[PDB]
Design a protein around this ligand. Sequence first.
Ligand SMILES: CC(C)(COP(=O)(O)OP(=O)(O)OC[C@H]1O[C@@H](n2cnc3c(N)ncnc32)[C@H](O)[C@@H]1OP(=O)(O)O)[C@@H](O)C(=O)NCCC(=O)NCCS
Length: 166
Amino acid sequence: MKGLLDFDILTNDGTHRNMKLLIDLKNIFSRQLPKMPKEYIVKLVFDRHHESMVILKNKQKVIGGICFRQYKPQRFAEVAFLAVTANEQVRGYGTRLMNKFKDHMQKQNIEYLLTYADNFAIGYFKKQGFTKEHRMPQEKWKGYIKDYDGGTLMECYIHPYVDYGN
Ligand SMILES: CC(C)(COP(=O)(O)OP(=O)(O)OC[C@H]1O[C@@H](n2cnc3c(N)ncnc32)[C@H](O)[C@@H]1OP(=O)(O)O)[C@@H](O)C(=O)NCCC(=O)NCCS
């Protein structure tokens, strides 16, 4: 594992240091992301407890990170979103999370991911493995649940025995 970067598992339990960093992630996304609905990332990022992995460009200097939580009886999952802060990206960190996200997506047994990704995260997701397009027409984008108007109903099919990292 090459890279001096530091990652951390945060939660919205309401501790203290976890919040400050968790906050960074929320603004980071909604920030670079065309004024995307803040409450959205906030909802998924602070959707009760939940688990997330951030980045640290100085041991505690948040820069990137992804947050999410899959549903068991639902067999579906939602991602708070991944993304490095503005003029902090283009360094090679974010991708480290997106992949870490997949490894976990399999450790939870949930493969039916979901989000309201826009052309921005769209291509960015389809690039890291995700799939913005589904067997059904895009016209069915409305109905993915949570958040109304903002991006596009994206999904991440976490098929079994897939080459994600393990
Ligand atoms: C997406 C991201 C994790 C990847 O960063 P990266 O691939 O290492 O490098 P980036 O190219 O993103 O670096 C930033 C610049 O590249 C562009 N860029 C942003 N996100 C990008 C991405 N996913 N892929 C390629 N280029 C991207 C931007 O124009 C940005 O311009 P600026 O910094 O001069 O204002 C990170 O750049 C980010 O958080 N961007 C904003 C959030 C976003 O787009 N989220 C959706 C993806 S899930």
